[PDB]
Design a protein around this ligand. Sequence first.
Ligand SMILES: Nc1c(C(=O)NCc2ccc(C(=O)NCCCC3CCCCC3)cc2)cnn1-c1ccccc1
Ligand code: NA
Length: 334
Amino acid sequence: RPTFYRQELNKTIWEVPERYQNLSPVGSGAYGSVCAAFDTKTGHRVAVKKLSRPFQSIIHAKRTYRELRLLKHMKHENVIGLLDVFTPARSLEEFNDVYLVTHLMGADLNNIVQKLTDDHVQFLIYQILRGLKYIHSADIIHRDLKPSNLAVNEDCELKILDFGVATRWYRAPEIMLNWMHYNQTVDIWSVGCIMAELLTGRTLFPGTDHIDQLKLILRLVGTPGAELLKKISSESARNYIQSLAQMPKMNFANVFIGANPLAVDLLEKMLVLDSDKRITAAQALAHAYFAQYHDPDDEPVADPYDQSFESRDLLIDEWKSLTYDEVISFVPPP
Ligand SMILES: Nc1c(C(=O)NCc2ccc(C(=O)NCCCC3CCCCC3)cc2)cnn1-c1ccccc1
Ligand code: NA
């Protein structure tokens, strides 16, 4: 077990291994309680996140466990990974604080987007889809993909993260309200909204609320057809839909005027209202738009992820003990 040192940063106490030096708060609360640090083991800059009141309630304790399980799972170039997790505690009874260490990323896509060049759009969306193929293969759904959850270094290498840009702007209509029926392609909707905004410089669906959000979405993609309406089990949802004056699907070529026609064709496949018909991440990687980058031998799937804990109703100290187990069993990447 390593030697720790104590300091106070912008109102928060930080007890970290001497391995991590030169701690400097980043963002403000945008990312949580996060410090840029120098990792003396590797000679790389890292980010250290100290979880806030991780075991204050059952729900905090389960969120803490969930975050650590997800982070320990992720082993892909386009997904944030866990470099280290540590507690200053020497025992479970002493255990109250959880620090996570990741790569320090350069900028988010919110603090980048001005238009981008079509080549930079191809590469960034390619990497998002490559990461999504990976987490979708583990039956993980991001559910809050948006530009602030995407980080990109000066080299344009991109990682998917979740720090949690209104979420509603990027959210699939089927999970805008009554979230009882959806699939992995809720994330593909979000990618379509992100790609549109990289191409145009403008939020595609800047809804002021959930009702304005659905209105903007149906304006572009049209009101549900007969085939989709047959699949809506919520009577309230059906009554809302069928009370709207009918609207045709726009020709996306007439909306994204001047865009690469292959980018427009991929947007048409991502922003399909019917989630049964929406392109998957694996399918989208094989789309002609990514001809320059697609390598079907270098788009790996994930190991299976046991999310059986999500269904469990446990006490604070149980979630705490499980979290402690995961800290102890952590094996750093080589
Ligand atoms: N602020 C940070 C950090 C940071 O906070 N690291 C620490 C950090 C800790 C956790 C996460 C995270 O994602 N928890 C959820 C994990 C599982 C999801 C992964 C995705 C798929 C769905 C499951 C993220 C970060 C690193 N770089 N920058 C940074 C960025 C831009 C500019 C300047 C600095
Ligand atoms: Na979403």
